[PDB]
Symmetry: C2
Subunit: 306 residues, 2 copies
């Protein structure tokens, strides 16, 4: 028992990481079959990032001006296609290490593991959540553009994220692996307004189920409520609106614990209004929102991979 | 920027995990060169775990009663040596996937990554700290005995932990890879008293340096103090005694921030006594103690591996 922010094993992802260079500018790429995906800002200089024209810049550029080290193995580029904000570099060799994969585009509120890389060399792995405003609150230093986010399904790697930029607010934005940004962001150096952030209510209710399962009872109440009523309280506390599709998804945990979603909302409602007052829930003194119900299910009931 | 509980890439460790079976009882092993290390409680039944005699039990047992799947590859055992609380099973094949490794024995207060496995299949990876009382507060379900903890040094994997048991208190105990338990614990089913736990002061002071680096200033104070004086306050709050060897180790962060250890203790001292009062430090409302100074240095200044 116990309960921790667990991340997926990174084995299958570490051997798709390579190093991309072009002019001075160097960052990370992802190698899968004969192709290297990377952020197209790679073609840009410090001066270019202010008001860059990708076409006019991309056109002074042909294959033999793109380095692609893969440790010490040297890939050679024969072709180069811009696809939205990613760049697809085609290469002579194909990755022996290519997992059974797929690109996907996730929704605000879902969780993935992030593999932070510098010079195509992996340095660490953490779990984080796409916030409602389409930013992530991660850990990225200068050089980390091209690091990726992923979920694992027994054998299959879903790629859901590629890191493109830090904002002036010190949060992170980026694209899917088709190159379409998450949120209203562009790959350009200017003040980009984010959006009001919100607490992910479906994930917080999952977090409280994890707590009961693990012996954390004290916050369970003798009261109760309805949906439309609870949302009202969730309005003035900047929680997201809970719906029917979230009562459905949370059903299995209701079945295990034997506590109906709405008897659980009644506990939370009380928590928003009266706070925690010197009290912890799984050694945390605020309401954790980065565990989907799917995450809690697979950590409280063990799961094979690979 | 930003700051997260980061864990080491697990690639190098996932391909040493195998599945060990013996009677009914099945758990995880670690395969390195020609040897499989595992917990010796593998030879025990549910009834045996109450008052087990390892000798008399080990002696009814020879090689051909030890299964060792490595996915679907079948290892055959030719020999079997008990070494303290681990068991060393020798096998016909040698691991092509064996990293440049070494066993070590760490100290209370140091951090490692844990790779939780079921049936020799990796399921997730988290960062945690050996507590002063030699327990870890991890995430382990039935079947997770034999999962390991590790640090990575560019190319080299240090193995520092093998999971042996959960206590009635729902915390975890286990051994080094030579088979000597951490703490006063035995591999037997009885009430085992742990010990008073303590906050790791050197790691908390590191955590506050990480915060200043990242824009978290508010808690920096106009006051100050000496060592012997601070410890006094740290007594009545169940913090560990800070020493000279901890001012030494913390020196580099003092050099970066330009805040002398003792000007930092003066901030903490105040925090213990007056609390946080509705206030967060890197989105946390209590004093985090699971980041060594070494961890903060390598997350706030990026590090290549492999």
């Amino acid at each position: 028992s116990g309960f921790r922010k667990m991340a997926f094993p990174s084995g299958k992802v570490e051997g798709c990481m390579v190093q991309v260079t072009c002019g001075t500018t160097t960052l990370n790429g992802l190698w899968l079959d004969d192709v290297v995906y990377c952020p197209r800002h790679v073609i840009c200089t410090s001066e270019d990032m202010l008001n860059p024209n990708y076409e006019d810049l991309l056109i002074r550029k042909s294959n033999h001006n793109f380095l692609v080290q893969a440790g010490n193995v040297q890939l050679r580029v024969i072709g180069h296609s811009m696809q939205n904000c990613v760049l697809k570099l085609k290469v002579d060799t194909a990755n022996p290490k290519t997992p059974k994969y797929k690109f996907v585009r996730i929704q605000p509120g879902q969780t993935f593991s992030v593999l932070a890389c510098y010079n195509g060399s992996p340095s660490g792995v953490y779990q984080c959540a796409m916030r409602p405003n389409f930013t992530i609150k991660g850990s990225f230093l200068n050089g980390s553009c091209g690091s990726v986010g992923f979920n694992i399904d027994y054998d299959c790697v879903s790629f859901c994220y590629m890191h493109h930029m830090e904002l002036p607010t010190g949060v992170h934005a980026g694209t899917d692996l088709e190159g379409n940004f998450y949120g209203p962001f562009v790959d350009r150096q200017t003040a980009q307004a984010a959006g009001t952030d919100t607490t992910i209510t479906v994930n917080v209710l999952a977090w409280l189920y994890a707590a009961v399962i693990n012996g954390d009872r004290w916050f369970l109440n003798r009261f109760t409520t309805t949906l439309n009523d609870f949302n009202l309280v969730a309005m003035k506390y900047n929680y997201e609106p809970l719906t029917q599709d979230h009562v459905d998804i949370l059903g299995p945990l209701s079945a295990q614990t034997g506590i109906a979603v709405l008897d659980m909302c009644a506990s939370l409602k009380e928590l928003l209004q009266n706070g925690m007052n010197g009290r912890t829930i799984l050694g945390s003194a605020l309401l954790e929102d980065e565990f989907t119900p799917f995450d809690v299910v697979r950590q409280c009931s063990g799961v094979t991979f690979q």
